[PDB]
Design a protein around this ligand. Structure first.
Ligand SMILES: O=C(O)c1cccnc1
Ligand SMILES: O=C(O)c1cccnc1
Lengths: 100, 100
């Protein structure tokens, strides 16, 4: 896999920065893959860096959703919860998701 | 107390209807008293009526908060959670409160 060609529809080539910046805006249909990618990255990180990264995820989720209506935010969060369930993922700790 | 005079700052004279209609808009500073009043009323109700009333509370909370921004809604919900804690009340089941 030293060939630079890629046509992958995933987050495996996205920078940590860019993964943080999309917090709260990733489509529900992509949420299981996003969450798997975040967990993959975090599992590798020293805890100081992991905590920093988690803070960024929260800050970006907050910024990215602050101006949404509650109706639109809840619709997304419900869909996210369901997608995560179907992907056999760990339940959100908080329904406001990554904001919190 | 047959004297019709009253100057009570509470929800003891508010109709069930009007208590339902204020769901999601009651100020955090009044939330413990509101919740106590709702629990008082519900404890008396037959379960069919209680379920109907609870549905109305959810419907009104939804309508009353749908167009709020997430930022403003979260600020309120956090304050509500804290007020309820301080009043030694039962934790919200859901952070979205009565919407859900
Ligand atoms: O809503 C989100 O953006 C979210 C919530 C949980 C896990 N991953 C993403
Ligand atoms: O946010 C509300 O309106 C609410 C939540 C829990 C209990 N009583 C009111």
């Amino acid at each position: 896999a030293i060939d630079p060609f890629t046509m992958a529809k995933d987050f495996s080539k996205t920078s940590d920065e860019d993964l943080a910046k999309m917090a709260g805006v990733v489509a529900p249909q992509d949420i299981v893959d996003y969450t798997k990618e975040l967990k993959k990255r975090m599992e590798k990180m020293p805890e100081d860096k992991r905590k920093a990264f988690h803070k960024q995820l929260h800050e970006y989720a907050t910024k990215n959703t602050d101006k949404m209506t509650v109706a639109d935010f809840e619709a997304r969060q419900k869909a996210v919860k369901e997608a995560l369930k179907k992907g056999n993922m760990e339940d959100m700790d908080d329904d406001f998701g990554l904001r919190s």
